[PDB]
Design a protein around this ligand. Structure first.
Ligand SMILES: COc1cc(CN2C(=O)N(Cc3ccc(O)c(OC)c3)N(Cc3ccccc3)C[C@@H](O)[C@H]2Cc2ccccc2)ccc1O
Lengths: 99, 99
């Protein structure tokens, strides 16, 4: 769909059998979700944002359905205030910026 | 123009006579730029990001040219690692997210 930016670009996602709302974030290279019950192995990683860095658990090959569209990619899970869908998954659902 | 998201969405901006590159960021409510010379009065403010909070100076009614489109709005200046154009100015240049 076309999303104007007068309010935050929030979308419903289904990940690990759970329903969540997440921000479509063109400034984010990675997808990072708040702490959740997600199965399997993960590697430690660190990401830096405004205000500093956070330690996240990195899961690969995770299925996410973002507004009905399936995608599989890396998901970082950790102490973010907001669920973020970043550019690694936005390219997969064919999302563009237009002006 | 239409911008796909395989690379960071960076654009040239002109602000206070100086030329800079900035990220088009739909996850950012506000525009925050690295420390720069900027004329005027300002109010201290704090913004929260992924690793925590930073103190910024808020400048109102600042002219910014973003890819040859002029906009006037609030600009926050402070210790961000990247120049961020957030939704307060993205709606002014008519930017939409599409998928
Ligand atoms: C509430 O408004 C604002 C919020 C921010 C902070 N914020 C961040 O901390 N991240 C960091 C980041 C997240 C995920 C990544 O995958 C990443 O990699 C580049 C960086 N970036 C900006 C950034 C990019 C590169 C380097 C440093 C910073 C994406 C933003 O939308 C936003 C995400 C966010 C929104 C709301 C709450 C928490 C985080 C900035 C400006 C604002 O006006």
């Amino acid at each position: 769909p076309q999303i104007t930016l007068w309010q935050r670009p929030l979308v419903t996602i289904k990940i690990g059998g759970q329903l969540k709302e997440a921000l479509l974030d063109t400034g984010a290279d990675d997808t990072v979700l708040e702490e959740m019950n997600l199965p399997g192995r993960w590697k430690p990683k660190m990401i830096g944002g405004i205000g500093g860095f956070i330690k996240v658990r990195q899961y690969d090959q995770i299925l996410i359905e973002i507004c009905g569209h399936k995608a599989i990619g890396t998901v970082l899970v950790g102490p973010t205030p907001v669920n973020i869908i970043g550019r690694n998954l936005l390219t997969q659902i064919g999302c563009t910026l237009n002006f």
